[PDB]
């Protein structure tokens, strides 16, 4: 006879993401040699680590200006990749195509002011479960860093990944009133003669930043 | 961790500064070849459809992640639902060729028909953005014709990307972007 077989039900239907290859129609073509062209990237995270991008603030400017008043809160926002501030970054660009992430998100600060102006800043991480701090003295109990202006114009701060579950959703669920990942807060301790001087901020992936489960959300 | 921001050299600070410990990462799901290999829908045209990766919507997962690289290379797999006989033609061949059964032709077999197609363009690597709005006619994998085509899908194979470009998310009106998440 001939080798018998059983055609099984529920198998063989086409799957858009399935892991198998089409039957080749038309063979024996050779490509023009492309070897060692410049600027190649094999992974979309590496370009996210090596190329930080700007944030978004009120007035639609990627910087925050020093302020003189009783209010030392310079900028304050949710830690999420769906935030409005992050929205313009490349890092929050990839997020919309993945459900979950873990790892560190780095923030870069660069003081733009003139050489005769000096300021001192505080960045801090407010974990979830309590209202975020409205004053640097209140924030001083959180995880924080502090730096001032000088020869080096740039500071880099790693925002830890700290959560109960090993991964966290990228998207922000509509039934979530308060951010699950907490907030990060940026304060101005004081400023010498810094009125009207700008601090540009940047964001990029950290060493351990990991992103998984691709999904097409529209957007 | 302070440094000179104007340098543009990448500086990644870690949690060990204030006494944390960096954890282990598994990045498989962000791999370019992995993430771009899957089918994405393209609104077809009744008879002749030129195979082009830029026809994919920009907001789809495959469309967006494609457009973030200036220079891309990959093979192609198509999945087509059509009436009649689906005829494929290589890059740069005349339109009058699509009427010849000698060219690769897949006779109708329900529900649909899946093919695997080589990279047929003359250029060493294709491009998502071209400086010269229009993109040159030489960027395409060829065309397919059938009596009518109901659905069309693209699946990239062996994808390779170069020179990344901006990738944008949806800009919230409120402080966050709140969506309804699947819940029991």
């Amino acid at each position: 006879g001939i080798f018998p077989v059983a055609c099984s039900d529920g198998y063989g239907g086409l799957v858009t993401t399935d892991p198998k290859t089409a039957d080749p129609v038309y063979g024996k073509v050779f490509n023009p040699p492309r070897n060692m062209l410049p600027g190649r990237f094999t992974n979309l995270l590496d370009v996210a680590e090596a190329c930080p991008t700007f944030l978004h603030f009120d007035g639609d400017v990627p910087y925050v200006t020093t302020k003189t008043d009783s209010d030392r809160v310079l900028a304050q926002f949710d830690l999420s990749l769906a935030a409005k501030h992050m929205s313009n970054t490349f890092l929050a660009g990839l997020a919309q195509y993945y459900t979950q992430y873990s790892g560190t998100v780095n923030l870069h600060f660069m003081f733009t002011g003139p050489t005769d102006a000096k300021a001192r800043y505080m960045i801090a991480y407010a974990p979830p479960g309590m209202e975020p701090p409205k004053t640097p003295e209140a924030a001083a109990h959180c995880i924080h860093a502090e730096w001032d202006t000088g020869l080096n114009s740039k500071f880099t701060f790693s925002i830890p990944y700290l959560s109960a579950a090993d991964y966290a959703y990228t998207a922000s669920d509509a039934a979530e009133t308060t951010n699950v990942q907490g907030w990060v807060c940026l304060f101005q301790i004081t400023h010498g003669k810094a009125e009207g001087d700008a601090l540009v901020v940047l964001a990029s992936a950290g060493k351990d930043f990991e992103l998984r489960l691709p999904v097409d959300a529209r957007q | 961790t302070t440094s000179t921001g104007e340098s543009a050299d990448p500086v990644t600070a870690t949690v060990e500064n204030y006494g944390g410990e960096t954890q282990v990462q598994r990045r498989h799901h962000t791999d370019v070849s992995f993430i771009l290999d899957r089918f994405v829908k393209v609104t077809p045209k009744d008879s002749i459809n030129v195979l082009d990766l830029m026809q994919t919507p920009s907001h789809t997962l495959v469309g967006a992640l494609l457009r973030t690289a200036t220079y891309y290379f990959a093979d192609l797999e198509v999945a087509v639902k059509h009436k009649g006989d689906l005829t494929w033609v290589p890059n740069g061949a005349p339109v009058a060729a699509l009427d010849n059964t000698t060219n690769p032709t897949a006779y109708h077999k329900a529900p649909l028909t899946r093919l695997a197609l080589p990279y047929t363009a003359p250029h060493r690597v294709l491009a998502t953005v071209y400086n010269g709005r229009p993109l040159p006619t030489s960027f395409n994998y060829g065309a397919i014709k059938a009596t009518r085509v109901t659905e069309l899908l693209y699946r990239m194979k062996r994808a390779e990307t170069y020179c990344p470009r901006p990738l944008l998310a949806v800009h919230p009106s409120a402080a966050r972007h709140k969506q309804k998440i699947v819940a029991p």
Epitope: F57, D58, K67, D69, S70, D71, V73, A75, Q76, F77, D78, A83, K84, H85, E131, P132, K134, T177, T178, W183 | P172, S173, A174, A175, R176, K178
Partner: nanobody, 117 residues
Framework: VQLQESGGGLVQAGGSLRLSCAAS????????MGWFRQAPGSEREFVAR????????YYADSVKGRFTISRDNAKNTVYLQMNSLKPEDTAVYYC???????????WGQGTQVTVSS
């Protein structure tokens, strides 16, 4: 934590209204406060903001100079004083609390305002 708008109504062009929003359930002096407006058939747009200290504000361009936001931490409430009203301003005005530069989360139900001409 729940918000309640009030002070809405009807008016004719050039008029003025004072909207009132009361907060409940937690400290009001720790929150930034802001207003959103949804004009019918358009998506909802931003209006104005006030920091917890009452010091800093921000106004949407179209409403810039016509409207004035103010909060009372003693009275646990926030106010939007609408002036030089214009038939475009017809919308439902949502009171919003929150932390972020835009106040966002913790919305009230919003009040109806129709200026006529």
């Amino acid at each position: 934590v729940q918000l309640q708008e009030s002070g809405g109504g009807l008016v004719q062009a050039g008029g003025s209204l004072r909207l009132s929003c009361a907060a409940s359930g937690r400290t009001f002096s720790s929150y930034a406060m802001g207003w959103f407006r949804q004009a019918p058939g358009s998506e909802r747009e931003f209006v104005a903001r006030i920091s917890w200290s009452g010091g800093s504000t921000y106004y949407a361009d179209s409403v810039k100079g016509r409207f004035t936001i103010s909060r009372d931490n003693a009275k646990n409430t926030v106010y939007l004083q609408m002036n030089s009203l214009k038939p475009e301003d017809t919308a439902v005005y949502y009171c919003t609390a929150g932390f972020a530069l835009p106040p966002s989360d913790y919305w009230g139900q919003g009040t109806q305002v129709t200026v006529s001409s």
